[PDB]
């Protein structure tokens, strides 16, 4: 299964998880990841974990125990990208809600907080508008 | 105007256009009856395109034989889409609209006036310029 | 047999080469020559006699170039670039990994290299060529901590996060005007990798929760996700998980399917319509996805209409709900839902829908007042804009003495937000080539297009319009059209002016000398605006 | 840039030569700089030929007529000798240059050896020799065609034979041939600011009229009026 | 005002690359620029060539005897060849 | 080298022979005899770290900078003041005359004197005397020498004149009888493309006195040899 | 014997660009093992096929499991054993192109082989290691059997 998933995701240029990933992640294979999750390469782990977002919500719910287990296996891994995608995904299978609690154990996001909250605070003069703001009427736009 | 002056004409040209379509398949007896009329035939029935569930020959398999000697040519069928080369199908036509003859053997495409007519660069032109007037005469007669 | 004789001959061959004394491995070679049975005296001649002091020669030559008055800096960059090319063609990543292995912190020469920017550029280039080199990975990580190729920018969370911090700081600094030229260089990186896209979008959703201009970060996320969409990617489900879509299962199901396929279908619209008509709607912010609204524009206003007259009211109801129904919230508590304008908005949208889908329409002159009052709704104006784009952009549209361009004039007059859109259409129509139109007819058509451009410029969108005019001047178009445009601009202009306005409008004003508002402007700007 | 990219054979990058050529030939070309100089002369004269064609064809149109198809002949050589382009070939570049030069000597339109005769010989086969040198540069021979030495020699012989067969035979009545071949298209001609066309226009040309039916000038501008409609 | 025998002249841009002004940019590539050409109803070529801002390289006529008077015999040969090529290639037919 | 106080191979020998500390002396030599720019000193141990000799770097920049010296003297050839030109050229001339004996610095002196219409007499004398220098000097030096040394000018015209008389005798006695071609057939321009006359014009330049020397040589030859 | 390639494939599309020939369809198939993309024109009339069908695919040089050739000559009377008896849909053709994502300095990682069977085209993209058995201008047999 590990060599199989490497063959089916080891293309180091297909950094987006390729289409049909929902088909490659059946329940048996989902239970087979955690047997040899750490034996795969970093990019394979990335694409594999990210493919869970493509699945139907029902199918995300069915094997959510295995998804949470594999996400914890990613949270204890060595690769930084694996660590942070695990940190985001830790709350995902239970509800479909991303984990926006990334400020902890991250100098990078703490620097995002410092530098870019300062920048956003200073850049509040003629603050630019989202795309959907064009559609809104005067009351909703002023709101 | 440095081109063939004659080519393939009305019924023969429409018939070969329908013949070289991708989905033409011929039984054993039909193929054997057609190989009778090929004057320049070697006498060896080629292996069919499909063997199981039944031995069937494609029309282009037969058309490879009448093409003489070993010639190579690239043409575009008259209804070739003008974006096939820009897609990921430059060598594998969805509509069989890219005529590729190689080593005197047709492997893909459908023939028409822009590949068998009088126009410059046609298949008959190259057949002349390589295989000589005699072999091109036999080529014309075998086609018809 | 013993290899000491071959090593002796190799040592003789290497020592015999010119200036071989300068090699630092010499010690081992000397050892290799002395233990095997050589002598320590012949090497003295093999090195010294063939020594010519080319180091001294190049030193004297550098002093010669310095003596002539040539700046030493350019020659120093030249020799450094020579070293860079030599190392690049000589590079061996395993040696770099060995320098990593001997001590995790590299020996301090590489820090001195980092102190000078040219070696940082070398390490950028080397990592671009060879991303699989842990020494180079740590080096570019140190530089980031202190033009990382997109593969190398995204290879480490640490590197990508720092570069993303600098990137979006640059985007916010450069604002709406530099958005176009800062977007692709960073959105390529973010749309390079599902992991990169997910991490960046998650951070942008974290950032947008702040109210002191986080909506700009939300726009940047919107541009990045539509960049993913046009690159053939699944930006839908990530966006749905990014919001409150999980609270409404069937809503996220329908929206994800519709966005994955990329076109509407009445089966899902029935579900969404029955959900929103009921007095427990999902938040209107949830369904205000600009891609979803673009699907509505692409479906309800294309030539056609390929729409069912029974389901039509459902599409229009959902559109007016997304555009006009105003929700009031208090601390993540939906206070109220305001369905006041949904009636009139749906009515106007239905009107304009019938008008654009009639296509028999010669009644357009009659429906003009209704068209303008319906255009007063902004979403209706966007729909009319896209319909006019698809209509006029078709070939052979011009067999009439025009009217749709007056509709674009009304759209630019009413809503300032749609100013970039209309220009983005007009310049397209300004560069399209026409065959069956006479050349004079094409010239008059372009004159009309520039009249519409001047009308847009009258509404305070002066700078990008004049910038495009100056571009297509210096980059093509006839000088007569540009002369006509500046004449029209000088017709209605009056003092006073701004610095940027003269910065963009004056430098175009010297390439011609044909016509008094002109000399009046020259005098005013020369006196006041240097 | 693209001319250099597609036609400058780089002897500086070893990896391309490892990929495309057998190791002995790579060491041969990399070792001595004489062969490298010869390849540089080839590129220099091809660049000169490029400028010459810019003078001759300012219209920038590549479709021309010539006695022999070189691309299809390369293809025929490939399929006769079963050349697999997925392998490093064995063709020496200097052999390609030498064979091209010898074939250029072998193809003669103007016989005799003197300054006028050699000048006319150069002028007659100028365009065909330029086409041959551009097509059979050692760059594309070792990069995309990947042709073998025996197949290359066969190609040179075949081009020689076909060119020598393409020479206009003496005794031909090219006068009547041109007359009939130009009279035949007149039989199918529709009879048409506007300009007269068809067989009335053709008659007005050949039957030279002191009064044309539509005497018109085609005037071109060069100032601002070349771009400026108003001044035009 | 104007030169006699020319009762009407029409201004237009060429719609085919053959007549567009083809230059060679610094890249060594061909760029075909749109340039205003004029087409006349009469022929006094010696008069128009002398006029200011009239390109005395590309300016030409469809008359033959004019070219014989003003340009020269080989120019007549070339112009005759171009005219026959135009009237033969008008219908798409090609001749060697 | 030692003319400008530069340590040559003899210094290296007297520091090597009769020295029980080759390692220390060689290390101090390699450090002190480096290129006098601070930025290189950070990179020279790294330059050598791979087993790459600094030799190749030295040779490449040697070629590059000497070529740039040639380019800059070519540039100052017709730049600004003639006084500034000849001042800097004479400075570089006197500097590299120490290194004119070297085989790689002699072309610098060749180019500098090629850009000088007149030179100090001692340099001309050394160029003439040392046969290797004269054979390796450009004709710009030789024109001035011949302007003060008619003997070598005669020595140079003499073999060319010998070859000219040899070809004249062969052409007058060229065994081929035909009305079309003979000794008198060639056009004057065809006879003026001879290497002898072109070489003589280069050797005279635009100086009247060299032309007078050629005149007197021609007088002597035509009179004593009785050959037209 | 000689089996230049073997795998099992699953169909994912029958005619995603619409119908062009009413007896042959352009099946798009994917390997569940190696991710070899397959686009094969199959006669649906004699050998009907459906979306989602699993099938063993073999690409071989001969059919007689001995390395014995027949130079493309039809011979219905050959009593020798046949590998084609183990399959349902058996075609014969010739590979006519082998492209790859190679550079001018390094070999290919992915190779794409285009093969013609009397006009019916087979594009097989995938890993170079599996497809190194293919040589251009070589006769070849396709052997397909559905797996219920």
From Swiss-Prot, chain A:
Where is it expressed, tissue-wise? Ubiquitous. Expressed in heart, brain, placenta, liver, skeletal muscle, kidney and pancreas. Expressed at lower level in adult lung. Expressed in fetal brain, lung, liver and kidney.
* Localization in the cell: Nucleus
Which top-rank group of organisms is this from? Eukaryota
Free-text comment about domains: The HDAg-like domain is essential for transcriptional repression, and mediates the interaction with the RNA polymerase II complex.
**What biological function has been recorded for the protein in this entry?**
Essential component of the NELF complex, a complex that negatively regulates the elongation of transcription by RNA polymerase II. The NELF complex, which acts via an association with the DSIF complex and causes transcriptional pausing, is counteracted by the P-TEFb kinase complex.
**What is the protein's quaternary organization?**
The NELF complex is composed of NELFA, NELFB, NELFCD (isoform NELF-C or isoform NELF-D) and NELFE; NELFA and NELFCD form a stable subcomplex that binds to the N-terminus of NELFB. In vitro, the NELFA:NELFCD subcomplex binds to ssDNA and ssRNA in a sequence- and structure-dependent manner. Interacts with the RNA polymerase II complex when it is not phosphorylated by P-TEFb.
Family affiliation: Belongs to the NELF-A family.
Name of the protein in question? Negative elongation factor A
Q: Which organism is it from?
A: Homo sapiens (Human)
Query: What is this protein's gene name?
Result: NELFA
Segment of the intact protein contained: 9 to 151 of 528
UniProtKB/Swiss-Prot annotation, chain C:
Keyword list (alphabetical) reads: Nucleus, Repressor, RNA-binding, Transcription, Transcription regulation
Instruction: Give the consequence of mutating residue 347 to M.
Output: Reduces RNA binding
Tissue specificity note: Widely expressed. Expressed in heart, brain, lung, placenta, liver, skeletal and cardiac muscle, adrenal, thyroid, kidney and pancreas.
- Protein name stated in the entry: Negative elongation factor C/D
User: Quaternary structure?
Assistant: The NELF complex is composed of NELFA, NELFB, NELFCD (isoform NELF-C or isoform NELF-D) and NELFE; NELFA and NELFCD form a stable subcomplex that binds primarily through NELFCD to the N-terminus of NELFB. Binds RNA which may help to stabilize the NELF complex on nucleic acid. In vitro, the NELFA:NELFCD subcomplex binds to ssDNA and ssRNA in a sequence- and structure-dependent manner. Interacts with ARAF. Interacts with PCF11. Interacts with KAT8.
Q: State the GO CC annotations.
A: membrane; NELF complex; nucleoplasm; nucleus
Q: Which family does it belong to?
A: Belongs to the NELF-D family.
Effect of changing residue 330 to M: reported as: Reduces RNA binding
Q: Which InterPro entries match?
A: TH1
Protein localization: Nucleus
Could you give a GO molecular-function term held by this entry? RNA binding
> What result follows from mutating residue 333 to M?
Reduces RNA binding
Question: What is an example of a Pfam family matching this protein?
Answer: TH1
Enumerate the PANTHER family for this protein.
Answer: NEGATIVE ELONGATION FACTOR C_D, NEGATIVE ELONGATION FACTOR D
Q: Specify the superkingdom.
A: Eukaryota
What is an annotated GO biological process for this record, any one?
negative regulation of transcription elongation by RNA polymerase II
Q: What does the protein in this record do?
A: Essential component of the NELF complex, a complex that negatively regulates the elongation of transcription by RNA polymerase II. The NELF complex, which acts via an association with the DSIF complex and causes transcriptional pausing, is counteracted by the P-TEFb kinase complex. (Microbial infection) The NELF complex is involved in HIV-1 latency possibly involving recruitment of PCF11 to paused RNA polymerase II.
Where is it mostly found?
Answer: nucleus
UniProtKB/Swiss-Prot annotation, chain F:
UniProt subcellular location: Nucleus
Q: What start-end ranges are recorded for coiled-coil regions in this protein?
A: none
Tissue specificity here reads:
Widely expressed. Expressed in heart, brain, lung, placenta, liver, skeletal muscle, kidney and pancreas.
Q: How does it assemble?
A: The NELF complex is composed of NELFA, NELFB, NELFCD (isoform NELF-C or isoform NELF-D) and NELFE; the N-terminus of NELFB binds to the NELFA:NELFCD subcomplex. Binds RNA which may help to stabilize the NELF complex on nucleic acid. Interacts with the first BRCT repeat of BRCA1. Interacts with KIAA1191. Interacts with NELFE.
Family as reported in the entry's similarity comment: Belongs to the NELF-B family.
The function of this protein is: Essential component of the NELF complex, a complex that negatively regulates the elongation of transcription by RNA polymerase II. The NELF complex, which acts via an association with the DSIF complex and causes transcriptional pausing, is counteracted by the P-TEFb kinase complex. May be able to induce chromatin unfolding. Essential for early embryogenesis; plays an important role in maintaining the undifferentiated state of embryonic stem cells (ESCs) by preventing unscheduled expression of developmental genes. (Microbial infection) The NELF complex is involved in HIV-1 latency possibly involving recruitment of PCF11 to paused RNA polymerase II. In vitro, binds weakly to the HIV-1 TAR RNA which is located in the long terminal repeat (LTR) of HIV-1.
Q: What is this protein called?
A: Negative elongation factor B
For this protein's source organism, the top of the classification is: Eukaryota, Metazoa, Chordata, Craniata, Vertebrata
